[PDB]
């Protein structure tokens, strides 16, 4: 009870007559609220995963991605990708992570070779034409494509690298067609003993086993945070509540406050209104372009007004400069409550009779213990 | 007299953060010693008047 709180605050088992300060009151946030402009520049991932024709892997396509929202809600919540894995980030956490550049690398391979695309792997694709760095922090995405990329006679349009002089560095696209030397002889002309053309085309047919089937491979990649964050996940938003104390975030501006409809008119380029002491006192809603006053949530010292301990245990509480409508958010039973110019006074009986000032409260009010 | 003032030393020094408040706890009595001083000033504005 408030008397026990004064005994604890005064570190005494008995308290003399007077008024004593105690732990400050503050109206709590009723709920949290996040406001961000409704999503519009969603990334061009249709131009990746739903492009009609893919490239061959020996000369795998690169698409650069920039200035967009890297939404994966349709991506990672679809079972339609048969192997989608990430290699230095959780695929769930991508919506709360930023990038800087992005690249999509797009190509077709055999189903026995999707395992070679992973960082730190080997086999003629990974060795000769498409190697990830061993520290690859991004993701590989792949899907079974026998209904798409097979041809009834074998889809020999889709080509791979069958030979190379040396096994390659990260993302080293090679467009050379010059003849490979399998033996110690020089290779001269287009063909000869131990000469091989460095490529071959895959036999993708509707009949093939779960291995000789085609798969469409994409790698999503990024070099991180050396520069402004030109690609990032979708900043979500929640309903706009008013006339209640709440924890807001508006376009990155945090605070806890009461939000109200403002009469202030901004010019179009502004978002935060400030007061003399460089504190925020208003904000624009990103999605509705109207101005909200920000007001700090009601708070005050709590003073306990008491006759002395042995005299009596009965006490009254003053919520300094709090309107009596707001104190019941916390003695909230009331029935003897008096809004004073000094604050909401709870548990003291208002008597019209003016006596001499005994215990001060403020703004002409005093309190005393009487019949 | 002058305008009576009082501060919640924690709300100033640590506005709406428990993480800051639990660090402020490392410093002991200063957030009370400051209020004893300001309440002494405030009580004397009535006395002077």
């Amino acid at each position: 009870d408030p008397l026990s709180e004064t005994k604890c605050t005064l570190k005494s088992f008995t308290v003399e007559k007077g008024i004593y300060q105690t732990s400050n009151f503050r109206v709590q946030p009723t709920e949290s609220i996040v406001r961000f402009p409704n999503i519009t520049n969603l990334c061009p991932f249709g131009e990746v995963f739903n492009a009609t024709r893919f490239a061959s892997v020996y000369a795998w396509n690169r698409k650069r991605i920039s200035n967009c929202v890297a939404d994966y809600s349709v991506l990672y919540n679809s079972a339609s990708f048969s192997t989608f894995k990430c290699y230095g980030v959780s695929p769930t956490k991508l919506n709360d992570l930023c990038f800087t550049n992005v690249y999509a690398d797009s190509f077709v391979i055999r189903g026995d070779e999707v395992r070679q695309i992973a960082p730190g792997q080997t086999g003629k694709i990974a060795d000769y034409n498409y190697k990830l760095p061993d520290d690859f922090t991004g993701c590989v995405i792949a899907w079974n494509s026998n209904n798409l990329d097979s041809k009834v006679g074998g889809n020999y349009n889709y080509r791979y690298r069958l030979f190379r002089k040396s096994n390659l560095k990260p993302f080293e696209r090679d467009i050379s067609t010059e003849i490979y030397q399998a033996g110690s002889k020089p290779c001269n002309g287009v063909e000869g003993f131990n000469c091989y053309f460095p490529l071959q085309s895959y036999g993708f047919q509707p009949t093939n086993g779960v291995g000789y089937q085609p798969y469409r491979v994409v790698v999503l990649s990024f070099e991180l945070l050396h520069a402004p964050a030109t690609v990032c996940g979708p900043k979500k938003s929640t309903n706009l509540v008013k006339n209640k104390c709440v924890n807001f975030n508006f376009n990155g501006l945090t605070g806890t406050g009461v939000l109200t409809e403002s009469n202030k008119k901004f010019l179009p380029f502004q978002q935060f209104g400030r007061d003399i002491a460089d504190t925020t006192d208003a904000v624009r809603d990103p999605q509705t372009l109207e101005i909200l006053d920000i007001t700090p949530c009601s708070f005050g010292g709590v003073s306990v007004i008491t006759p002395g301990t042995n005299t009596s245990n009965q006490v009254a509480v003053l919520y300094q400069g709090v309107n009596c409508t707001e104190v019941p958010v916390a003695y909230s039973t009331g029935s003897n409550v008096f809004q004073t110019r000094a604050g909401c006074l709870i548990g003291a009986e208002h008597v019209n009779n003016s006596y001499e000032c005994d215990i001060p409260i403020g703004a002409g009010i005093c309190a005393s213990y009487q019949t | 007299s002058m305008t009576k003032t009082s501060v919640d030393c924690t709300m100033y020094i640590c506005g709406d953060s428990t993480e800051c408040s639990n660090l402020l706890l490392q410093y002991g009595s200063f957030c009370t010693q400051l209020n004893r001083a300001l309440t002494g000033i405030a009580v004397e504005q009535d006395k002077n008047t």
Binding site: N24, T279, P296, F299, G362, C366 | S1, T49
Partner: peptide, 23 residues
Amino acid sequence: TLKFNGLTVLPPLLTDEMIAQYT
């Protein structure tokens, strides 16, 4: 010619009406 951030301004015990009466 004459609340934020935990700072508070408290009223004097005697109002400007009570000072006008003593005066």
